[PDB]
From a paper:
We expressed and purified the dROS1 ECR (construct 1–6) and obtained a 3.94 Å structure using single-particle CryoEM. Surprisingly, model building only resolves the N-terminal region (equivalent to construct 1-4) starting from the N-terminus to the fourth FNIII domain. The C-terminal domains starting from the fifth FNIII domain to the sixth, including the intervening YWTD-C, were not observed in the map. The lack of density for the C-terminal domains is consistent with this region demonstrating greater flexible with respect to the N-terminal domains. Interestingly, the model reveals that rather than having a linear arrangement of domains, the N-terminal region adopts a folded-over conformation stabilized by an interaction of an N-terminal cysteine-rich region with the second propeller (YWTD-B) and fourth FNIII domain. The domain is comprised of two disulfide stapled helical hairpins that associate with one another through hydrophobic interactions. The two helical hairpins generate two loops (capping loops 1 and 2) which stabilize the N-terminal ECR compacted fold. In the loop generated by the first helical hairpin, capping loop 1, F235 sits between R1234 and L1236 of the fourth FNIII domain. F231 sits between R1032 and L1034 of the second propeller. Our structure, of dROS1’s N-terminal ECR—being compact rather than linear, suggests that the bulky ECR could physically keep the kinase domain at distance and prevent oligomerization and signaling in the absence of ligand binding.
Residue numbers in the entry: 215 to 357, 377 to 755, 764 to 1289
């Protein structure tokens, strides 16, 4: 069925190959020494060879047509390729819809049988038993690297016991890798084996992943963690060890398995701490994860009772003002004849927001030096809310998002719900907040910085965000008292007068240890104020300032309140309690992209902690300094916003190691980030070509700006395209197909007007004027001349990625497993590096000819390793330059040298980013985002600003003169076929390929000398048909055909 294909391809391609030996078949020619006969022999012996599966090269040995039947090898190999494709279609059409399964598990009957596969038997001969294959296992991760087993014993049974070290307690998915063909995306798979979990029994190997280590409060460090990627046995707890940096105070806490946070208590303030997260299971402990954090620096008690900050004392009808300094003023502010509900507080403006039981909003701007102020009503709007009667009960002020939060009362009979609104300062922009509820509101306080609104009803302490999206419970007991959340400590101080507990519940509803409430020094309290660690307790008719140390309930200071014996609420009048912004979290993940004279610096916003909501205030001013390592010219650029910035006008002779700081809205110096490397002047202008998968080619600058699209369109999934000259270029597409295109004059005919299938990569040599492409069908390489269009074959086998060094003619080929250089002599063929069948395959390689260096890519199990090697020293300085972290695969052949920049450029599989590795600083991989007009990209080249040099005629050895072909004086059985040495204009070493035809026998010789010593000739005076093709290490000359007779 495929022999017809062989014959048709042979007759089509009979004259397409102009062999170097000077053999030429015309149509209807029955010459047996020529291409068609060898190809027919190849596809007649191809099946016989496949009986025992011998190599085509050794199957094509000819007893009369030495040394190599290259058309026979080609015919055999394409026969194998077509046969394998046909078998692929057959195996896909018959079944291929059956997965390897595990129905019976390792028993407890004393048989320790590991993974077993009992999978149906639909297989033909040959491919069943003698055919080897590989099995790879899939890692089950929901948010890894796929490896292949190295040990499995099985046969026609297909029950493969695996001694591979599978790590216990990790879910696996198995599958069969069936190798059909040589292309990466030309392989079929077995769909999926049902997920199987290997039994447990080992210590944990992964330390717990710590995701948040906030410095909550001054002495209440908190830590967030979860299971590590690996478990190794069921987990029953964790080991938390905290060690001080200046002391021996080490606290070790143990936590059951199910928990996602932990909080320590009673720590020293203003000192750096470290935390030891340990993952522990039944059989033992595991690794240790370390974290560095310093707790918030507290506010010391300061002048004992002399601080100038005041407090607002509130009674039934009073807004009394009092300051804590000794003999402080007790100036009364304002009186009302109705019952007062609560107050608010503004720091940016000395203005109060009073509200009685009837919802009368009275502005009470604290006049500078005068208590008397207008008490005008601030009648609110209700058209946008509802037409019913609405009387607010509790209110509070937001000092960052200038607003006024209220607790509303609906007029519903027997199911009167309560609601929150967010009006404007004058109270006109009514806004729906959250959902309705039936329990009455007793106190509303809003935390502006971290973005939360806290209220307490008779039962719980519901917490909400500024808008009303997330509502989360905090605590539910009987009749909670007063709480005084402060924005710079992340903890709430909840008082209970009946139980006398005075809790310290944290923001997430966890850490909840009560404190010793100070007993009265003579009753009940309804509020308090927090002056640092000291507690300000407003007793009735007496204000005590107690240093809260437990049993230290002694009044450090007292201020009579004989004008108000029924105080119920106190608020500390300190500017720190309403700060404009909070801790200056340093920017993280600094990234620098550099070009010729411009740079694109991108760095991420400081990460938020879970205690602050989405609507939390995060307004950030930025600044960035740039200094030279050598010149030390430092300059900082302020008034910058956004996570992305573009540097402009870098000065020459400079390195730009860079580091970025974040400036708070107040204007206080932030925390410096880590330094980052840079890059110096390459030369100047460059031109990168981006090949989009849709076929659009886009030219950009070094960074990707200055886009200049091209008017012409390429085919689907193109590869790097090689310029024959300034006009015509070759390229290879994703499915193994090449097209010849013309950039400027499309009407001009290409050297070959039909695209060629099954091609891997193409390269052009400027000195030889010939273009080479890797032919997977023939498993060899061919010669193409853009002018003549003739084909000549080069005996290089399994050639996948090609590159030619034009200086000395050595041809460098990269097979899938081994790398070597093919020269004019067998002794010169030196393998630079060889991989085995398990570590991976060569992905791409580029040749550096000015530096006499060779580079290549080695695809691995889960990472790609860069290498180097000298061409003059065989395998002497192999280096592991960069092992990429993560499963990032580079497109084959996409690796192209960057002579301006002196680096290597390859494109990842995604096609959205490119990676740069520089010779001077290999340890830094530079990202390059693909332009969106070209994303995703399939090929990236750097066009040399220098024009491609013209073809050099100085080579191309002159045709051997027919009159110069003579047989010099020797015996008829030992004589030299001597011709005048073909002279190349560059004095290059000329080699001669000799075709000798005598009778029905053909003798061929590859000679580095202008003479051929012929021995063992059967008879004297024989008529010898001599064909001489003078060849240099780069090009082949015209063939000379001469007939001679042996002289004495």
């Amino acid at each position: 069925r495929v022999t017809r294909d062989c014959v048709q391809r042979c007759i089509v391609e009979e004259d397409l190959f102009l062999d170097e030996f000077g053999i030429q078949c015309e149509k209807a020619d029955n010459g047996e020494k020529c291409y068609k006969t060898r190809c027919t022999k190849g596809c007649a012996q191809w099946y016989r060879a496949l009986k025992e599966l011998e190599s085509c090269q050794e199957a094509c040995l000819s007893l009369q047509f030495y040394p190599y039947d290259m058309p026979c090898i080609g015919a055999c190999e394409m026969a194998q390729r077509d046969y394998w494709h046909l078998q692929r279609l057959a195996i896909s059409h018959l079944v291929e819809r059956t997965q390897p399964q595990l129905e019976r598990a390792p028993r407890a009957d004393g048989q320790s049988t590991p993974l077993t596969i009992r999978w149906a038997m639909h297989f033909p001969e040959h491919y069943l038993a003698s055919r080897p294959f590989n099995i790879q296992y899939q890692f089950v991760d929901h948010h890894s690297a796929w490896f292949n087993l190295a040990d499995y014993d099985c046969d026609e049974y297909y029950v493969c016991e695996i001694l591979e070290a599978l790590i216990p307690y990790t879910q696996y998915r198995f599958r069969f890798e069936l190798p059909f063909g040589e292309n990466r995306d030309e392989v079929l798979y077995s769909p999926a084996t049902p997920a199987y979990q290997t039994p447990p029994e080992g210590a944990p190997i992964s330390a717990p992943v710590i995701e948040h280590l906030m410095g909550l409060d001054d002495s209440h460090l908190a830590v967030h963690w979860h299971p590590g990627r690996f478990t190794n046995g069921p987990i029953e707890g964790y080991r938390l060890r905290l060690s001080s940096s200046e002391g021996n105070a080490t606290s070790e806490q143990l936590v059951p398995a199910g928990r996602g946070s932990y909080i320590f208590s009673q720590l020293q303030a203003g000192t750096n701490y470290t935390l030891a997260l340990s993952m522990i299971n039944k059989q033992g402990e595991g690794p240790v994860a370390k974290g560095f954090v310093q707790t918030h620096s507290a506010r010391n008690e300061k002048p004992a009772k002399d601080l100038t900050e005041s407090v607002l004392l509130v009674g039934r009808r009073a807004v009394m003002w009092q300051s804590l300094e000794p003999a402080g003023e007790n100036s009364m502010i304002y009186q009302s004849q109705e019952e007062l509900a609560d107050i608010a507080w503004s720091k940016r403006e000395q203005q109060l927001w009073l509200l009685n039981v009837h919802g009368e909003l009275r502005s009470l701007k604290f006049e500078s030096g005068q208590m008397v102020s207008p008490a005008q009503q601030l009648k609110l709007d209700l058209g946008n809310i509802s037409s019913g009667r609405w009387v607010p009960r509790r209110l509070s002020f937001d000092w960052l998002h200038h607003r006024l939060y209220f607790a509303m009362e609906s007029p519903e009979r027997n199911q009167s719900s309560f609601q929150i609104i967010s009006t404007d300062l004058l109270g006109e922009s009514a806004q729906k907040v959250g959902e309705s509820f039936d329990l009455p509101v007793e106190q509303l306080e809003v935390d502006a910085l971290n973005g939360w609104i806290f209220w307490r009803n008779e039962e719980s302490l519901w917490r909400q965000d500024l808008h009303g999206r997330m509502i989360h419970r905090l605590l539910r007991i009987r009749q909670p008292g007063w709480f005084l959340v402060q924005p710079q400590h992340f903890i709430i101080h909840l008082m209970l007068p009946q139980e006398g507990k005075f809790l310290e519940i944290s923001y997430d509803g966890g850490f909840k240890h009560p404190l010793p409430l100070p007993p009265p020094s003579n009753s009940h309290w309804q509020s308090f104020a927090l002056l640092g660690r000291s507690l300000l307790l407003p007793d009735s008719g007496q204000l005590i300032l107690v240093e809260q140390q437990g049993q230290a309930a002694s009044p450090s200071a007292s201020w009579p309140l004989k004008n108000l014996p029924d105080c119920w609420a106190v608020i500390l009048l300190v500017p720190e309690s309403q700060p404009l912004t909070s801790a200056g979290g340093k920017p993280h993940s600094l990234k620098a992209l550099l070009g010729a004279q411009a740079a694109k610096i991108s760095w991420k916003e400081p990460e938020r902690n879970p205690y602050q909501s989405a609507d939390a205030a995060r307004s950030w001013s930025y600044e960035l300094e740039v200094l030279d390592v050598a010149s030390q010219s430092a300059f900082s650029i302020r008034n910058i916003r956004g996570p992305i910035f573009g540097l402009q006008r870098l000065q020459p002779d400079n390195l730009y190691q860079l580091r970025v700081r974040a400036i708070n809205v107040d204007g206080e110096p932030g925390e410096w980030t880590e330094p980052l490397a840079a890059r110096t002047w390459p030369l100047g202008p460059h031109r990168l070509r981006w090949a989009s998968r849709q076929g659009s080619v886009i030219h950009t600058n070094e960074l990707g700006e200055g886009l200049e699209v091209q008017q012409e369109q390429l085919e689907r999934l193109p590869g790097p395209m090689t310029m024959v000259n300034e006009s015509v270029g070759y390229y290879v597409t994703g499915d193994g197909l090449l097209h010849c295109i013309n950039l400027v004059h499309s009407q001009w005919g290409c050297p070959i007007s039909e695209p060629l299938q099954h091609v891997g990569s193409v390269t052009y040599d400027w000195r030889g004027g010939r273009v080479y492409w890797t032919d997977l069908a023939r498993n060899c390489v061919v010669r193409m001349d853009p002018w003549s269009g003739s084909r000549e074959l080069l005996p290089v086998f399994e050639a996948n990625f090609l590159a030619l060094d034009p200086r000395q003619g050595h041809l460098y080929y990269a097979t899938s497993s081994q790398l070597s250089r093919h020269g004019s002599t067998p002794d010169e063929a030196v393998t630079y590096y060889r991989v085995n069948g398990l570590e991976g395959s060569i992905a791409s390689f580029v040749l550096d000819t000015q530096q006499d260096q060779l580079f290549w890519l080695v695809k691995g199990s889960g990472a790609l390793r860069l290498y180097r090697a000298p061409l003059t020293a065989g395998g002497d300085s192999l280096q592991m330059i960069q092992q990429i972290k993560g499963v990032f695969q580079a497109v084959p052949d996409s690796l192209q040298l960057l002579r301006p920049l002196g680096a290597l450029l390859w494109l990842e599989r995604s096609g959205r980013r490119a990676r740069l590795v520089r010779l001077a600083a290999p340890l830094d991989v530079m990202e390059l985002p693909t332009p969106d007009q070209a994303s995703p990209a399939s090929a990236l080249q750097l066009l040399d600003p220098q024009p491609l040099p013209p073809r050099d005629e100085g080579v191309i050895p002159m045709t051997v003169l027919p009159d110069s072909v003579r047989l010099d004086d020797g015996h008829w059985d030992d004589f030299h076929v001597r011709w005048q040495p073909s002279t190349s204009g560059g004095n290059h070493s000329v080699s001669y390929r000799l075709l000798l035809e005598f009778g029905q026998r053909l003798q061929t010789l590859d000679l580095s000398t202008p003479f051929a010593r012929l021995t063992q000739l059967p008879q004297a005076q024989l008529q010898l048909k001599i064909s001489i093709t003078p060849r240099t290490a780069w090009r082949s000359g015209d063939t000379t055909r001469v007939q001679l007779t042996t002289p004495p």
